[PDB]
Design a protein around this ligand. Structure first.
Ligand SMILES: Nc1c2ccncc2cc2cnc(NCCCN3CCOCC3)nc12
Length: 338
């Protein structure tokens, strides 16, 4: 793919690459000048020339055709696909150019969190956008800060010599949801593994089956990450992941522990985890009950955390819906009209 995506390369006799926006395992996203739409800047995802990413981009194109047609004004904040083409046997998908991923925005400010006012606006929009997928018999499955992007370059940035980086200050926090290559329809076959490990629901970890509620878990993890500036589940390993959930959210429902065929992780009805090993005293030291991450006892911080705690309900049958979520008191402040 190195061979086909340099600056100055022209795709489909119109898209001139000017910059790289994002890399990763699926392939590359590049900024292009569209010489056939009056020099409008767009994004083109170049898909890695492999079975996996080919069929996932074929599916993504089908999903976007449906979302974009159903919601032409993008009221529900899903990215607009403009077209797709083939370039040296890679699928390329053209998109409206958005601003920074929320991931890159936090990362490049030294992992400093978003303001509560911004998080309220962003959480509302994420919940409204993914509730639209929910309404339309879809689950995203891979919600994570890399897949939430600012609509606009609506920030200022200044070089701060004291700390030798640009700091970027958000003016307007409006977002859209991207990447529908994993999005699964209610009646389609359901992959065993889904989500980036840090945002993966407990029912996905435990192979108990999944649908719309696994997205709600992911959003929960996103929101605390926006509030703190870092993931509360940093780990690579599922048993440590489950130890961290226990430390932060309490014990897992016995029914989930006893039902799972991933019995590898467990011993009788307990997590099989030496709490007193140096790896367990790590998790203990690293993790505290969820409500202790609060930076303020201020009621608006209490509203957010009550929502976050509902999103991280272990039992996906009991987990809050985005329908209910949009009605949570954390959002009331958005609906002020006196
Ligand atoms: N980075 C993207 C844009 C940047 C600017 N404007 C429009 C964009 C549209 C995109 C549409 N799709 C994707 N990515 C698909 C999945 C990539 N994610 C998940 C993996 O980590 C990287 C981000 N990225 C996109």
């Amino acid at each position: 793919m190195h061979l086909i995506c340099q600056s100055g390369d022209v795709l489909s006799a119109r898209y001139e690459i000017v910059d790289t926006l994002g890399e990763g395992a699926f392939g590359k996203v590049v900024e292009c000048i569209d010489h056939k739409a009056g020099g409008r800047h767009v994004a083109v995802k170049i898909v890695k020339n492999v079975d996996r990413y080919c069929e996932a981009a074929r599916s993504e194109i089908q999903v976007l055709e449906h979302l974009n047609t159903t919601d032409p004004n993008s009221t529900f904040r899903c990215v607009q696909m403009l077209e797709w083409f083939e370039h040296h046997g890679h699928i390329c998908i053209v998109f409206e150019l958005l601003g920074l991923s929320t991931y890159d925005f936090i990362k490049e400010n030294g992992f400093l969190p978003f303001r509560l006012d911004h998080i309220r606006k962003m959480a509302y929009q994420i919940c409204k956008s993914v509730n639209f997928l929910h309404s339309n018999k879809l689950t995203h499955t891979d919600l994570k800060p890399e897949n939430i992007l600012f609509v606009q370059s609506d920030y200022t940035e200044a070089y701060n010599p004291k700390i030798k980086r640009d700091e970027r200050t958000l003016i307007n926090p409006d977002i859209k949801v991207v990447d529908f290559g994993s999005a699964t329809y209610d009646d389609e076959h359901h992959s065993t593994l889904v989500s980036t490990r840090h945002y993966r629901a407990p029912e996905v970890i435990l192979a108990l089956g999944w649908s719309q509620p696994c997205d709600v878990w992911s959003i929960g993890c996103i929101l605390i990450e926006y509030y703190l500036g870092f993931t509360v589940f940093p780990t690579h390993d599922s048993k440590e992941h489950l130890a961290m959930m226990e430390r932060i959210l309490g014990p897992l429902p016995k029914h989930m522990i006893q039902k799972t065929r991933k019995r590898k992780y467990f011993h009788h009805d307990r997590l099989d985890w030496d709490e007193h090993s140096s790896a367990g005293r790590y998790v203990s030291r690293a993790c505290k009950p969820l409500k202790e991450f609060m930076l303020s006892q201020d009621v608006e911080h209490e509203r957010l955390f009550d929502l976050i705690q509902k999103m991280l309900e272990y039992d996906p049958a009991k987990r809050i819906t985005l329908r209910e979520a949009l009605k949570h008191p954390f959002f009331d402040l958005l609906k002020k009209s006196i």
